[PDB]
Amino acid sequence: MTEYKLVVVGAGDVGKSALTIQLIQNHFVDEYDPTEDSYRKQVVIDGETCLLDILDTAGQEEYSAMRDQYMRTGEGFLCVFAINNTKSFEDIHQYREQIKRVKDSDDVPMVLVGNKCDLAARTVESRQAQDLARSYGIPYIETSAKTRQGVEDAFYTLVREIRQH
Ligand SMILES: Nc1nc2c(ncn2[C@@H]2O[C@H](COP(=O)(O)OP(=O)(O)O)[C@@H](O)[C@H]2O)c(=O)[nH]1
Ligand SMILES: [Mg+2]
């Protein structure tokens, strides 16, 4: 059993907790804002039996006892913005820079996640986020914590990025 420590970061309100809860507990956080838990789930991924630790961090606008500790321990990161929140997408760069600083490494397993892809209108274009992720050298995956679309894709891609590291 290999343990994978995955950290979800991003600005407030983008769906960090919704995504984590959707993956671990298979239901949609229709406003249940936890106040930065940690989660574990045993799952078989690509024939490997894994223990996933999901560390759900708070945005930099909010008090957080554990975000710095969660970030130092994490092996891979989901960098999450909401496709209807332009500031959240602009904040991605700070979040990535800080991950690189805490891990003391430029080659940290990461996935850029554009969440809320269920929505009818958006202010951040896929092409933008794909170009930014390309410049970072990481995958871009669009997700919906509401519909569960792409959620396992995001988290498992992170796991496979950790395996390649
Ligand atoms: N429509 C839609 N709403 C979402 C999605 N993910 C989160 N939300 C909503 O966005 C708000 C903030 O979600 P939350 O998980 O607490 O974001 P966090 O602050 O980053 O942890 C909540 O009201 C959620 O119901 C999504 O994929 N689609
Ligand atoms: Mg949250």
From Swiss-Prot:
Which gene specifies this protein's sequence?
HRAS
Enzyme Commission code(s) on record? 3.6.5.2
Look up the record and name the associated disease.
Costello syndrome: A rare condition characterized by prenatally increased growth, postnatal growth deficiency, intellectual disability, distinctive facial appearance, cardiovascular abnormalities (typically pulmonic stenosis, hypertrophic cardiomyopathy and/or atrial tachycardia), tumor predisposition, skin and musculoskeletal abnormalities.
What is the originating organism of this protein? Answer: Homo sapiens (Human)
Q: What is the effect of changing residue 32 to F?
A: Loss of interaction and recruitment to plasma membrane of PLCE1
Catalytic reactions on record: GTP + H2O = GDP + phosphate + H(+)
**Consequence of mutating residue 60 to I?**
Moderately increased transformation of cultured cell lines
Q: What is the effect of changing residue 88 to C?
A: Found in a patient with severe fetal hydrops and pleural effusion; uncertain significance; decreased activation of Ras protein signal transduction
Give the record's membrane topology: Lipid-anchor
Which UniProt key words apply to this protein?
Acetylation, Cell membrane, Cytoplasm, Disease variant, Glycoprotein, Golgi apparatus, GTP-binding, Hydrolase, Isopeptide bond, Lipoprotein, Membrane, Methylation, Nucleotide-binding, Nucleus, Palmitate, Prenylation, Proto-oncogene, S-nitrosylation, Ubl conjugation
Please list the residues annotated as glycosylated: 35
Tissue localization of expression is: Widely expressed.
| Protein name according to UniProt | GTPase HRas
Q: Which residues bind GTP?
A: 13-18, 29-35, 58-59, 115-118, 144-146
**Effect of altering residue 60 to K?**
In NMTC2; somatic mutation; increases transformation of cultured cell lines
Q: How does it assemble?
A: In its GTP-bound form interacts with PLCE1. Interacts with TBC1D10C. Interacts with RGL3. Interacts with HSPD1. Found in a complex with at least BRAF, HRAS, MAP2K1, MAPK3 and RGS14. Interacts (active GTP-bound form) with RGS14 (via RBD 1 domain). Forms a signaling complex with RASGRP1 and DGKZ. Interacts with RASSF5. Interacts with PDE6D. Interacts with IKZF3. Interacts with RACK1. Interacts with PIK3CG; the interaction is required for membrane recruitment and beta-gamma G protein dimer-dependent activation of the PI3K gamma complex PIK3CG:PIK3R6. Interacts with RAPGEF2.
Q: Where in the cell is it found?
A: Cell membrane; Golgi apparatus; Golgi apparatus membrane
